[PDB]
Amino acid sequence: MGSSHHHHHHSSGLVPRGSHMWKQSVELAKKDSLYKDAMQYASESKDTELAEELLQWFLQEEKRECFGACLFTCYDLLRPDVVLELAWRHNIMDFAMPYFIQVMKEYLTKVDKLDASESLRKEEE
Amino acid sequence: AKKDSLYKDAMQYASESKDTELAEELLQWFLQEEKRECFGACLFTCYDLLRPDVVLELAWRHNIMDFAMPYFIQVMKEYLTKVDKLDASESLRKEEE
Amino acid sequence: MGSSHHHHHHSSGLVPRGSHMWKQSVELAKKDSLYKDAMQYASESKDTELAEELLQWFLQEEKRECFGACLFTCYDLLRPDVVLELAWRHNIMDFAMPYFIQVMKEYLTKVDKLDASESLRKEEE
């Protein structure tokens, strides 16, 4: 029922409860912090293209903000590739494990197609 | 043989034709030595659509290397066989009644 | 004066089976002794979790004892995952890719399944 679309540029729109995008602009309100709590509502959200651009900068700088963004990535599934480049960057790092999930459909499909023809051949003979 | 410019022009007139093991094997020797000569050949291997191994070996030389990965095109396949197994069971079962 | 009686009986029970491989030299110039022997023969058992539990402590504080454990599941079929977490235990790892072989028939039954229909359709209408 609720759809929220935010494109970037200049100017300032502040509506209380949740997200905060960057880029220079003088603003002040009241009460700070909340990076993890605000980091949770961005994963189990959506953001296909828009999402990604965020993590690069989180995985580009900081040491904890990379880790979190990593755990941030894993609980959304479909988003590797990029993760790897950023690891072959400056130093060593820790990968995950998005492979096994795929080993299923692999050897899975085959067997299906197999008995799929063995039958379509015993009905004509 | 003679000279060398002739070499660098060969491997290059063989990339257009391109074959199987003929176009494959040709590469390892284009990698046995020289610099960019190995590079230009590294392109050919992948052109064969499917050829690792020689991508791992020459990777353990000295400096950094490259890489690429397929996938996905496969992802949009099992989703098709799962739609056929259903429509071949719904009507096949709604008939035994 | 003298009598000799040699009675030789040989009954071979088709049961005893010993598999002996090889791999001692290579180019590394670093060998650590102890263990080994009874671990390469037990490798012919595997299966179930208890089988993988055998790669746990055999792939820990061991070197020339991990490869013998590597030349174990490759002889098998499919069983990765941990095969990687250990190479990230603290050091490096060598060889692998026991699935780059099946990477063929797939895309083939792939570019083939498309044409198997693209014709019967150009054939239809």
PDB file of all heavy atoms in Angstrom, chain A residues 93-95 100 113, chain C residues 78 81 88 105 109:
ATOM      1  N   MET A  93      40.823 -10.412   3.057  1.00  0.00           N
ATOM      2  CA  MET A  93      39.501 -10.172   3.564  1.00  0.00           C
ATOM      3  C   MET A  93      38.875 -11.542   3.710  1.00  0.00           C
ATOM      4  O   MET A  93      39.498 -12.541   3.340  1.00  0.00           O
ATOM      5  CB  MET A  93      38.647  -9.423   2.509  1.00  0.00           C
ATOM      6  CG  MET A  93      39.035  -7.984   2.113  1.00  0.00           C
ATOM      7  SD  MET A  93      38.821  -6.732   3.413  1.00  0.00           S
ATOM      8  CE  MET A  93      39.447  -5.185   2.595  1.00  0.00           C
ATOM      9  N   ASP A  94      37.616 -11.541   4.171  1.00  0.00           N
ATOM     10  CA  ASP A  94      36.798 -12.730   4.416  1.00  0.00           C
ATOM     11  C   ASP A  94      35.548 -12.855   3.571  1.00  0.00           C
ATOM     12  O   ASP A  94      34.622 -12.056   3.669  1.00  0.00           O
ATOM     13  CB  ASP A  94      36.366 -12.771   5.866  1.00  0.00           C
ATOM     14  CG  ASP A  94      37.522 -12.828   6.788  1.00  0.00           C
ATOM     15  OD1 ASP A  94      38.661 -12.682   6.291  1.00  0.00           O
ATOM     16  OD2 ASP A  94      37.301 -13.019   8.003  1.00  0.00           O
ATOM     17  N   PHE A  95      35.506 -13.902   2.768  1.00  0.00           N
ATOM     18  CA  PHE A  95      34.373 -14.138   1.907  1.00  0.00           C
ATOM     19  C   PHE A  95      33.204 -14.764   2.676  1.00  0.00           C
ATOM     20  O   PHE A  95      33.191 -14.802   3.901  1.00  0.00           O
ATOM     21  CB  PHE A  95      34.798 -15.053   0.788  1.00  0.00           C
ATOM     22  CG  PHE A  95      33.813 -15.127  -0.306  1.00  0.00           C
ATOM     23  CD1 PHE A  95      33.063 -14.003  -0.656  1.00  0.00           C
ATOM     24  CD2 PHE A  95      33.625 -16.312  -0.996  1.00  0.00           C
ATOM     25  CE1 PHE A  95      32.136 -14.059  -1.687  1.00  0.00           C
ATOM     26  CE2 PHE A  95      32.698 -16.387  -2.031  1.00  0.00           C
ATOM     27  CZ  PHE A  95      31.948 -15.252  -2.380  1.00  0.00           C
ATOM     28  N   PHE A 100      26.741 -23.651  -2.492  1.00  0.00           N
ATOM     29  CA  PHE A 100      25.935 -24.838  -2.238  1.00  0.00           C
ATOM     30  C   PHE A 100      24.498 -24.700  -2.755  1.00  0.00           C
ATOM     31  O   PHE A 100      23.997 -25.598  -3.449  1.00  0.00           O
ATOM     32  CB  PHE A 100      25.917 -25.140  -0.733  1.00  0.00           C
ATOM     33  CG  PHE A 100      25.209 -26.418  -0.380  1.00  0.00           C
ATOM     34  CD1 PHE A 100      25.695 -27.644  -0.830  1.00  0.00           C
ATOM     35  CD2 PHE A 100      24.041 -26.398   0.382  1.00  0.00           C
ATOM     36  CE1 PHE A 100      25.030 -28.830  -0.532  1.00  0.00           C
ATOM     37  CE2 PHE A 100      23.365 -27.578   0.688  1.00  0.00           C
ATOM     38  CZ  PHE A 100      23.863 -28.798   0.229  1.00  0.00           C
ATOM     39  N   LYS A 113      15.096 -33.837 -16.485  1.00  0.00           N
ATOM     40  CA  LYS A 113      15.049 -33.980 -17.936  1.00  0.00           C
ATOM     41  C   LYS A 113      15.252 -35.426 -18.378  1.00  0.00           C
ATOM     42  O   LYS A 113      14.717 -35.880 -19.405  1.00  0.00           O
ATOM     43  CB  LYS A 113      16.108 -33.068 -18.564  1.00  0.00           C
ATOM     44  CG  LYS A 113      16.208 -33.238 -20.074  1.00  0.00           C
ATOM     45  CD  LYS A 113      17.037 -32.144 -20.746  1.00  0.00           C
ATOM     46  CE  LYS A 113      17.453 -32.549 -22.167  1.00  0.00           C
ATOM     47  NZ  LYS A 113      16.324 -32.956 -23.049  1.00  0.00           N
TER      48      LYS A 113
ATOM     49  N   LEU C  78      30.375 -35.192  -4.929  1.00  0.00           N
ATOM     50  CA  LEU C  78      30.065 -33.821  -4.547  1.00  0.00           C
ATOM     51  C   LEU C  78      30.069 -33.644  -3.021  1.00  0.00           C
ATOM     52  O   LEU C  78      29.377 -34.351  -2.276  1.00  0.00           O
ATOM     53  CB  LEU C  78      28.696 -33.407  -5.131  1.00  0.00           C
ATOM     54  CG  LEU C  78      28.361 -33.682  -6.614  1.00  0.00           C
ATOM     55  CD1 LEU C  78      26.957 -33.154  -6.963  1.00  0.00           C
ATOM     56  CD2 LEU C  78      29.402 -33.029  -7.508  1.00  0.00           C
ATOM     57  N   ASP C  81      32.023 -26.849   0.358  1.00  0.00           N
ATOM     58  CA  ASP C  81      31.693 -26.036   1.517  1.00  0.00           C
ATOM     59  C   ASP C  81      32.863 -25.903   2.455  1.00  0.00           C
ATOM     60  O   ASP C  81      33.700 -25.020   2.301  1.00  0.00           O
ATOM     61  CB  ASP C  81      30.474 -26.614   2.266  1.00  0.00           C
ATOM     62  CG  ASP C  81      29.178 -26.579   1.434  1.00  0.00           C
ATOM     63  OD1 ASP C  81      29.110 -27.271   0.401  1.00  0.00           O
ATOM     64  OD2 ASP C  81      28.216 -25.867   1.817  1.00  0.00           O
ATOM     65  N   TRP C  88      40.815 -21.048   4.721  1.00  0.00           N
ATOM     66  CA  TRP C  88      40.689 -19.716   5.275  1.00  0.00           C
ATOM     67  C   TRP C  88      40.923 -19.848   6.738  1.00  0.00           C
ATOM     68  O   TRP C  88      40.679 -18.917   7.463  1.00  0.00           O
ATOM     69  CB  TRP C  88      39.288 -19.120   5.028  1.00  0.00           C
ATOM     70  CG  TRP C  88      39.030 -18.701   3.594  1.00  0.00           C
ATOM     71  CD1 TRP C  88      39.020 -19.519   2.504  1.00  0.00           C
ATOM     72  CD2 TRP C  88      38.759 -17.369   3.097  1.00  0.00           C
ATOM     73  NE1 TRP C  88      38.764 -18.793   1.363  1.00  0.00           N
ATOM     74  CE2 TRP C  88      38.600 -17.476   1.695  1.00  0.00           C
ATOM     75  CE3 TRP C  88      38.638 -16.107   3.695  1.00  0.00           C
ATOM     76  CZ2 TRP C  88      38.323 -16.361   0.879  1.00  0.00           C
ATOM     77  CZ3 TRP C  88      38.362 -14.999   2.879  1.00  0.00           C
ATOM     78  CH2 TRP C  88      38.208 -15.138   1.490  1.00  0.00           C
ATOM     79  N   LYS C 105      28.049 -30.281 -20.337  1.00  0.00           N
ATOM     80  CA  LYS C 105      26.740 -30.803 -20.765  1.00  0.00           C
ATOM     81  C   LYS C 105      25.541 -29.912 -20.463  1.00  0.00           C
ATOM     82  O   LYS C 105      24.462 -30.086 -21.029  1.00  0.00           O
ATOM     83  CB  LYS C 105      26.493 -32.211 -20.164  1.00  0.00           C
ATOM     84  CG  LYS C 105      26.593 -32.309 -18.630  1.00  0.00           C
ATOM     85  CD  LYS C 105      26.426 -33.741 -18.091  1.00  0.00           C
ATOM     86  CE  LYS C 105      27.616 -34.627 -18.436  1.00  0.00           C
ATOM     87  NZ  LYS C 105      27.469 -36.010 -17.905  1.00  0.00           N
ATOM     88  N   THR C 109      23.148 -28.685 -23.310  1.00  0.00           N
ATOM     89  CA  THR C 109      21.756 -29.148 -23.347  1.00  0.00           C
ATOM     90  C   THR C 109      20.919 -27.907 -23.216  1.00  0.00           C
ATOM     91  O   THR C 109      19.693 -27.927 -23.190  1.00  0.00           O
ATOM     92  CB  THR C 109      21.454 -30.154 -22.189  1.00  0.00           C
ATOM     93  OG1 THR C 109      22.373 -31.266 -22.232  1.00  0.00           O
ATOM     94  CG2 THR C 109      20.032 -30.704 -22.325  1.00  0.00           C
TER      95      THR C 109
END
